[PDB]
Design a protein around this ligand. Structure first.
Ligand SMILES: [Mg+2]
Ligand SMILES: [Mg+2]
Ligand SMILES: [Mg+2]
Lengths: 48, 95, 100, 49, 88, 52, 141, 315
RNA sequence: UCGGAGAAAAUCCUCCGAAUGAUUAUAACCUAGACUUACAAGUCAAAGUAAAAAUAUCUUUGACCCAGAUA
């Protein structure tokens, strides 16, 4: 019972693992986008 | 240590040795690495691997551990399914 | 510490032996000689160690090395010391396993 | 085991138990030293007849 | 002798001969050996299992080709070059 | 300062490893190798272990 | 039978025997220098003022297959010694010789600008189409 | 300061590589490890330059070249020299003539016919499977009238008993001019038989110019001959006996592996058990054992053990 | 106590820092051969396997016992 309970637990979390990794990449990218976007502002260009 | 005990008149084992080292019948002694369980969060991965290993002892250390234990700990033990079954003997040792 | 040359030129060196330890690039990796993180030099093959000088060309990507290289006078190029181990044995031999 | 049988120290006609092995001195048992008996070991299997 | 042997069914015999041609002697007998133990019991046991595995794998069709290993990749690429070289 | 935090695998396994985080920053989340699953999965902060 | 006699140790003398099998040594050092020397064969493309040359050279330093725009046969069928198509055409000529010589796997080490250069990109396309692999396989240990 | 400075990376690289080639006092890695044709040539070029269509294609980067025309022209001009490089690179001149080098001059052509639709060519360094080489190949080498020839085909590294010796496959003698059927078949054609697991064997075609017809009675072999003891043959000493009338002029060689057809050859006609070889690497180096392997892991004992199975001695 | 630098392998010889953080592409397991070393501790690493489809990048220290926190 312990082995089966452990195995199904891993499977359920693993099933949702793809989507969760996808979400964490979106947050990381948009975090970078804000840095690069606000870094490349026309106001920043105005100073440049 | 005690060379001649009051009750039996015998040598006495230093139990702190028996609690830290393994004797293979060939005469070798095994031990762990000091600090292998300490502050692992700041140790490098290669350093941690080195710490996890079982390591042999030198000739002088082996001589000291032999003095600090009695003959009972130097005997042959025939344990079923022993994981050190193969390491109680030396092979192709010319010296 | 005890930095220096562990293996000198003309010595038989096995696959993993360390040849030299250096705080700075006193010697450079050559042929069949690898680099450690600490910049130590170890053999990658069984052979005889050789120290030889040769021209230095850096990776294009790194800016500083290219700029220094380009700024060199047109006449000549800079040099460096390289360490080499000459493999002393063949990779393997073919033997008769079975006759059918 | 073959060596003991060949030299007559173990009688193959009757059943063999730990008593027979001990009586013929084929094996030495120390119960006080945690012996629980004898295990058959494959060594010599090729030449056992 | 693979072909003469009747205990193996004929359809299996043909597949085994093609698949394991390298292990068939000039006399036509299928020669397999084991040298992985000091006791001939296990060496014989290892040899027998090869016979059983060979029969079973021939009986069951290997539909899956699996991934192409680098050795297969090198073999395939050099074969293509030979074809292109022989454009004559 | 900096605190040592315990990142826990979100693949359902009990696997976790300790990392260091600057207390001013938000809770850390990383992609890391889970030996019990043999795949790279998200590790999410669960507890603070000590202050570095 | 006299025929059955076979020497215990075979001695194949073909220079490319181990290299073709994949067990031959590739130099793995030169970590501080560019380009790496872990190649059985290398493609060297030199663009001079006049002409453009492509070579295949072994580690020992002996050129095996050479295709150059300074060669009479190629010159008569081309319009200019240096050109983007030239690179393409010489690459195709080089490949056929490379296939002819049996050198199917090779190492090319372009510079960042050279790799981005359109002429070199087209030349690599010709070699890939010809069947010459620009990346060598890993050694067998 | 007087000298200019390299303004680009490439200039230094070209200078460096040329610098490396030159020998130097210090130790280095390398040590241890006619007129009418010119005028006609120029005239054709000018015509090509004049052609507007050539310009338009080039500027449109759509131009192309005919490979076959270049190959034939390359053969006439410098094909002999490039072929020499391959022969030296492949070791033919050192294994065949004990270091003597001859430039090939006759554009020898050989191809193995597969059925009748197409025929596999045999260039320098080509790869041909033994199945493809089952039957003798067509040979056309443009002799011209007269000038008798001898064609010799041998596997340089296929010998199974003596390393230096090699096995003849077929030898044609007194070949008059182009026609090759008119040659005496001293050695019948044999299919290649490279042993399994023995690597790549290099087989070469050798063509010798014959000043005067010479009977090679010593080199005649019974047809068919299936004895390897009789196929053993040295090119070097053979050329010594006939060097007066034999001078090499043609080359063509290919690499072949073992194949299922090789199994047929070893059994059907050679009538012997086929040899099987495997590549063996030397045993790994381990330092001499110490009775006390101080500061070594438990694995130290496994390095020097031979059998992985328990032993019991007197027990 | 340890690290960096001069004298240059001596000194009560002369200086700077550390009991670090930052940075992140998160950096596995297993295993030849070596360095350093009284012991203890500390370094580098081919091959193989496994994740991915570039390593972490900057450049250090505290043993044993004994107490904790968890699955
Ligand atoms: Mg006993
Ligand atoms: Mg120590
Ligand atoms: Mg590796």
């Amino acid at each position: 019972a312990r082995r089966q309970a452990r195995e199904q637990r891993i499977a359920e979390c693993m099933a949702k693992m793809p989507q969760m990794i996808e979400n964490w990449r979106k947050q990381k990218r948009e975090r970078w986008e804000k840095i690069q976007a606000d870094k490349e502002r026309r106001a920043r260009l105005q100073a440049e | 240590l005690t060379y001649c005990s009051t009750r039996k008149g015998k040598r006495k084992t230093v139990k702190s040795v028996v609690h830290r080292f393994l004797r293979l019948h060939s005469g070798l002694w095994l031990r762990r690495k000091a600090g292998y369980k300490k502050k692992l969060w700041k140790k490098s991965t290669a350093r941690k691997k080195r710490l996890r290993e079982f390591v042999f002892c030198s000739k002088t250390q082996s001589k000291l551990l032999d003095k600090m234990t009695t003959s009972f700990w130097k005997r042959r033990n025939w344990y079923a399914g022993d994981p050190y079954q193969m390491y109680h003997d030396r092979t192709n040792l010319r010296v | 510490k005890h930095y220096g040359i562990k293996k000198m030129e003309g010595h038989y060196v096995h696959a993993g032996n360390i040849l030299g330890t250096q705080r700075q690039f006193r010697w450079h990796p050559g042929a069949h000689v690898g680099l450690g993180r600490n910049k130590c030099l170890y053999a990658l093959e069984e052979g005889i160690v050789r120290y030889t000088k040769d021209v230095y060309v850096p990776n294009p990507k790194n800016t500083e090395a290219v700029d220094l290289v380009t700024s060199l006078p047109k006449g000549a190029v800079l040099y460096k010391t390289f360490v080499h181990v000459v493999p002393a044995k063949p990779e393997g031999t073919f033997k008769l396993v079975d006759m059918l | 085991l073959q060596y003991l049988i060949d030299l007559g120290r173990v009688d193959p006609t009757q059943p063999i138990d730990l008593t027979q092995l001990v009586n013929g001195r084929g094996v030495t048992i120390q119960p006080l030293k945690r012996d629980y008996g004898v295990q058959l070991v494959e060594e010599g299997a090729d030449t056992f007849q | 002798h693979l072909a003469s042997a009747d205990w193996i069914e004929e359809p299996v015999r043909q597949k085994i001969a093609l698949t394991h041609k390298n292990k068939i002697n000039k006399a036509g007998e299928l020669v397999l050996t084991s040298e992985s133990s000091r006791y001939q019991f296990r060496n014989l046991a290892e040899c027998l299992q090869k016979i059983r595995d060979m029969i079973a794998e021939a009986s069951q069709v290997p539909k899956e080709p699996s991934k192409e290993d680098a050795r297969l990749q090198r073999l395939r690429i050099e074969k293509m070059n030979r074809e292109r070289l022989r454009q004559k | 300062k900096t605190i040592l935090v315990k990142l826990v695998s979100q693949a359902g396994t009990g696997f976790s490893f300790n990392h260091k985080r600057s207390r001013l920053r938000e809770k850390l989340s990383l992609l890391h190798y889970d030996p019990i699953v043999n795949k790279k999965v998200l590790f999410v902060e669960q507890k603070k272990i000590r202050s570095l | 039978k006299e025929n059955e006699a076979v020497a215990p140790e075979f001695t194949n003398r073909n220079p490319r025997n181990l290299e073709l099998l994949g067990v031959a040594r590739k130099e793995r050092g030169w970590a501080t220098v560019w380009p790496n020397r872990e190649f059985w064969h290398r493609l060297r493309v030199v663009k001079t003022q006049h002409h453009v040359e492509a070579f295949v050279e072994h580690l020992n330093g002996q050129v095996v297959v050479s295709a150059s725009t300074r060669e009479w046969a190629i010159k008569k069928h081309l319009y200019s010694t240096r050109n983007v198509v030239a690179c393409e055409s010489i690459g195709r000529v080089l490949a056929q010789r490379c296939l002819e010589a049996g050198i199917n796997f090779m190492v090319y080490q372009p510079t960042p600008w050279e790799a981005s250069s359109d002429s070199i990109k087209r030349l690599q396309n010709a070699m890939t189409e010809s069947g010459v692999m620009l990346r060598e396989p890993r050694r067998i240990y | 300061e007087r000298l200019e400075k390299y303004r680009s990376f490439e200039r230094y690289r070209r200078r460096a590589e040329q610098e490396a080639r030159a020998p130097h006092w210090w130790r280095t890695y390398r040590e241890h490890f006619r007129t009418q044709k010119l005028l006609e040539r120029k005239h054709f070029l000018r015509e090509l330059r004049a052609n507007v269509e050539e310009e338009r294609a080039a500027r449109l980067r759509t131009a192309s070249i005919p490979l076959e025309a270049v190959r034939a022209e390359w053969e006439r001009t410098c094909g002999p020299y490039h072929k020499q490089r391959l022969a030296e690179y492949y070791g033919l001149y050192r294994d065949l003539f004990h270091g003597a080098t001859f430039v090939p001059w006759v554009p020898l052509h050989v191809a193995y016919a597969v059925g009748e639709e197409d025929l596999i060519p045999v260039y320098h360094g080509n790869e041909v499977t033994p199945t493809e080489a089952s039957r003798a190949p067509e040979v056309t080498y443009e002799a011209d009238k007269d000038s008798l020839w001898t064609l010799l085909f041998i596997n340089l590294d296929g010998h199974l008993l003596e390393p230096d010796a090699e096995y003849v496959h077929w030898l044609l003698t007194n070949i008059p001019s182009n026609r090759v059927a008119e040659g005496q078949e001293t050695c019948p054609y044999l299919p290649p038989f490279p042993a399994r697991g023995s690597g790549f064997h290099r087989f070469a075609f050798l063509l010798f110019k014959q000043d005067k017809p010479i009977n090679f009675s010593e080199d005649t072999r019974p047809s068919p001959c299936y004895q390897l003891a009789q196929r053993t043959f040295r090119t070097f000493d053979f050329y010594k006996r006939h060097q007066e009338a034999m001078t090499p002029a043609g080359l063509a060689f290919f690499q072949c592996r073992w194949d299922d057809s090789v199994t047929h050859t070893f059994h059907q006609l050679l009538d012997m058990r086929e040899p099987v070889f495997e590549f063996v690497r030397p045993p790994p180096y381990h330092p001499k054992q110490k009775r006390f392997p101080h500061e070594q892991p438990l694995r130290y004992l496994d390095r020097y053990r031979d059998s992985h199975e328990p032993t019991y001695g007197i027990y």
